[PDB]
Symmetry: D2
């Protein structure tokens, strides 16, 4: 269970991260 | 500026993604 | 400029991290 | 096996990504 719960959480974290990137990518235009 | 906060946010999210993933790989060997 | 290439590189790496992770979560339910 | 091989690869990708971030973070100083 915990294994499948970490992979779910880690996916969450990864999707949170990709938000941050695209925002940062847009800012790089500025 | 925002790209700052976006990049810092992203790095954190990956660490949470990393440490969780490490628990997961551990469960597999169990 | 380099931050450009660094950000683009990072976004790609996360996608490879994402799609692999999706295969992994799938194996768990098996 | 494949499950434990994806998590290994996804960890690789995550570590590749974190290189890209820190480089990008330093560039943000400029
Ligand atoms: C905006 C910036 C700020 C605003 C913009 C909003 C969105 C997005 C950007 C942007 C980055 C900014 C700034 C920064 C603030 C600020 C605000 C603003 C809101 C907005 C939301 C989104 C949205 C993303 C966007 C990124 C992007 C990052 C950028 C950073 C910081 C930083 C920080 C603040 C803060 C707030 C907060 C809001 C929240 C929204 C979301 C998400 C998330 C996106 C991320 C994240 C980055 C990150 C943080 C925090 C933080 C969080 C939080 C909210 C979250 C959330 C997310 C992230 C958080 C965090
Ligand atoms: C440097 C930039 C460029 C040089 C600097 C070198 C290192 C780092 C940065 C930096 C980013 C740059 C540029 C860009 C080139 C360029 C070069 C330079 C070399 C260097 C290595 C590292 C190092 C990281 C560093 C980041 C950082 C990103 C930045 C981007 C691009 C981009 C691109 C080139 C290219 C080459 C190549 C070299 C290689 C090294 C490593 C790693 C990796 C780091 C990453 C990655 C980012 C990314 C890409 C590619 C790519 C790759 C590759 C090499 C790899 C590798 C990595 C990444 C690749 C990729």
């Amino acid at each position: 269970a915990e294994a499948e719960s970490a992979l779910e959480y880690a996916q969450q974290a990864l999707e949170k991260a990709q938000l941050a990137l695209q925002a940062a990518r847009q800012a790089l235009k500025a």
